[PDB]
């Protein structure tokens, strides 16, 4: 019961934390897209922020670190 | 006449007999008592 109390507490404040994180990531992604537009200016055939997945479904950017979340 | 053979086994191997009884209780409870408790809960 003690654990469920803590876990319910985490559940009620989840949406606001997620919304904050979403706003942060969107702003950072816009900045990175402007950066890529500048760097790849004068490279023909480019498309800024092209989705590499054919389905077009959204995935977070891959990081190239095997297990970053545990450290 | 296997009723003092078990007596003799218990007298000579108390540790093995105790281990068998303890583990047998641990096996008997989920095998028999748990389905009974599950059945009484359904009704």
């Amino acid at each position: 019961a003690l654990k469920e109390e803590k876990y319910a507490a985490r559940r009620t404040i989840l949406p606001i934390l997620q919304a904050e994180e979403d706003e942060r990531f969107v702003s950072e992604w816009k900045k990175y897209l402007e950066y890529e537009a500048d760097v790849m200016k004068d490279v023909p055939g480019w498309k800024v922020g092209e989705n590499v997945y054919n389905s077009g479904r959204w995935m977070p950017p891959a990081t190239g670190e095997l297990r970053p979340d545990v450290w | 006449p296997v009723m003092e053979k078990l007596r003799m086994f218990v007298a000579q191997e108390p540790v093995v007999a105790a281990s068998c009884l303890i583990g047998g209780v641990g096996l008997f409870l989920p095998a028999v008592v748990r389905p009974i408790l599950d059945s009484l809960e359904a009704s």
Binding site: - | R7, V10, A11, P14, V15, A17, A18
Partner: protein, 54 residues
Amino acid sequence: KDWNTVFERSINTLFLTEMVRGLSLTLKYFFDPKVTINYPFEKGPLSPRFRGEH
């Protein structure tokens, strides 16, 4: 021989009953006074017949 005596033997073997008495009377001497002599301030007893240095 009998279920009661076999049970009593099994319990005594499993519960180390006879090991308890040794622990108890070792513990009894723990609180009693000690026999050690505080040499050289205190000495052991000797008799007028003691054969020491010529």
